[PDB]
């Protein structure tokens with residue numbers, strides 16, 4: 001595929017595709033994404049880093065924001081603790097094969113002229129738009145705090161200071177991204193990746209016990225977690241095992257089976273896996289066994305690289 | 310009078326009087342008030358500086374915050390312009406006989422550890438309490454901005470950084486002051502001065518054409534403005550001419566009158582002026598003439614001191 005195609009693959013939306021095409025013409029271009037530091041880096045995070053690797057392979061310089069100050073404003077704990085989790089996150093990302101510039105928010109988000117810009121932005125940003133932009137991001141709170149409306153302005157200002165042409169994240173970031181397109185002189189091209197379902201089949205993959213696969217999980221945890229996952233016979237939509245198969249597995253792959261149960265299956269693609277599953281030619285237990293074993297192998301270089309440090 | 314009494318004179322409230330008494334015991338104590346820089350410094354401002362002078366005479370060190378960054382967050386214009394008005398305000402205050410430390414907000418309100426505290430505060434401050442605290446301060450806006458809820462936290466944080474035992478302002482500051490008492494480790498004693506009615510008799514004295522007496526107004530403007538002021542025969546409540554007579558004039562004073570209109574009046578106090586006015590022994594035109602002429606004299610040292618620079 002060409003650069004545009006490689007970038008577009010497996011995305012949910014690009015705001016806008018015409019602007020992306022303009023950016024691609026440039027000799028130098030850059031892209032960022034932020035992570036509120038997370039004690040587990042799971043497949044949802046990995047999907048985003050895979051997109052950053054695609055951008056890098058399309059000649060973008062990559063900035064990964066370790067968003068320690070933003071995590072602090074979104075009630076993730078004390079800054080010193082969040083930074084220590086930040087350090088671990090950086091190492092995981094590095095273990096995934098990303099070559100990037102890694103920046104801690106607090107290295108610049110407290111500088112005098114950054115802060116002055118936060119306040120300039122605050123004069124332009126309505127409380128209503130700021131609250132609405134956080135509906136899929138703010139930590140639940142019955143008595144919403146001022147911090148909640150500072151957060152999206154800090155993300156916008158950080159996009160500005162990073163200098164990037166493209167900003168990347170999950171679909172839930174789209175309202176903060178629209179704010180950035182309205183508030184800054186240079187309109188950032190925004191690339192949104194799909195949100196991966198959790199193992200439980202109750203909403204997005206998150207740190208909830210048994211609800212995520214961490215990229216550094218042991219083989220026995222990957223098996224245990226996949227075995228327990230929501231995965232009804234025939235059902236592809238909202239089936240996290242099928243989503244894993246779509247976004248992470250390599251094809252062709254073969255699934256191992258005695259004759260009386262149909263015999264072996266050579267699976268040329270995800271689309272073949274889908275039609276086999278939807279037609280009930282392939283059952284949940286065998287699908288889960290395949291996916292776990294294939295995932296273990298896919299993730300092995302990340303585990304090994306981490307263990308070796 | 311004793312120190313407590315001198316401080317309490319002409320105040321609307323002291324939160325709390327018991328805490329003020331504790332503060333008075335200290336060998337070193339300090340008090341602040343802020344001003345969003347204002348193109349005119351009027352009698353309402355002068356009433357507050359008179360209270361700061363009382364505190365100073367009671368052995369407080371006085372800090373006057375020239376609140377350039379706060380004015381910026383409350384839509385008073387560009388920072389460079391606001392600072393130039395700030396410089397002029399400082400000179401007026403000095404011309405009133407106040408000896409103080411004058412500090413521009415922007416000298417410290419953009420420092421890294423100040424900013425970090427703003428964000429700590431923001432985590433503790435509800436959007437609802439922040440908006441409610443600004444009901445009598447925020448510039449009118451149909452689409453309220455994030456800046457509005459940053460403002461009261463910056464005032465609270467500035468009280469903290471100033472180190473003061475006492476914070477002073479008009480009654481409208483009381484909700485921001487209550488927030489400061491809840492958010493900071495040391496509870497500041499808060500002294501609220503009454504809000505002076507404008508000349509128009511429509512709400513508070515402000516910069517509105519003809520609505521204020523500036524402390525540096527010429528004699529002919531003071532006369533013209535007083536002559537036009539709302540001042541109905543008999544009516545003391547909401548009568549700005551009577552408020553001026555109460556808070557600024559020196560007693561005893563004599564009012565000049567031909568025999569057929571009652572003859573001269575020696576006025577021992579404001580309370581005598583009040584009973585004469587309420588009983589219609591003294592008419593609006595004569596009251597206005599007296600007040601203007603007495604005000605001109607009271608303000609003359611401020612004008613002279615300013616003109617002499």
Ligand SMILES: Nc1ncnc2c1ncn2[C@@H]1O[C@H](COP(=O)(O)O)[C@@H](O)[C@H]1O
Nearest residue numbers: 035036044045169170194195196204205
């Ligand atoms: N379940 C998920 N699926 C896809 N992306 C995700 C998922 N969870 C987190 N991310 C992305 O990782 C970045 C950091 O999100 P968070 O861990 O929620 O701070 C954001 O762009 C998210 O959209």
Ligand SMILES: Nc1ncnc2c1ncn2[C@@H]1O[C@H](COP(=O)(O)O)[C@@H](O)[C@H]1O
Nearest residue numbers: 344345353354478479503504505513514
């Ligand atoms: N009409 C007024 N009467 C009494 N104090 C006032 C008046 N106008 C402003 N001030 C005080 O001066 C300080 C600065 O207010 P402002 O000029 O509104 O920023 C505040 O403590 C106000 O309460």
Ligand SMILES: N[C@@H](Cc1ccc(B(O)O)cc1)C(=O)O
Nearest residue numbers: 033034035036065067070158159
């Ligand atoms: N709001 C993102 C976090 C984030 C995104 C970008 C940046 B940045 O500096 O470009 C920072 C934080 C999240 O939900 O985790």
Ligand SMILES: N[C@@H](Cc1ccc(B(O)O)cc1)C(=O)O
Nearest residue numbers: 342343344345374376379467468
């Ligand atoms: N809110 C006040 C302004 C103000 C008060 C105090 C301070 B301070 O630094 O203590 C600053 C501004 C006003 O309405 O004008």
Ligand SMILES: [Cl-]
Nearest residue numbers: 127128436440
């Ligand atoms: Cl709000």
Ligand SMILES: [Cl-]
Nearest residue numbers: 234235236237
């Ligand atoms: Cl389905």
Ligand SMILES: [Cl-]
Nearest residue numbers: 281282283286
């Ligand atoms: Cl099967």
Ligand SMILES: [Cl-]
Nearest residue numbers: 543544545546
């Ligand atoms: Cl009355």
Ligand SMILES: [Cl-]
Nearest residue numbers: 590591592595
């Ligand atoms: Cl008379």
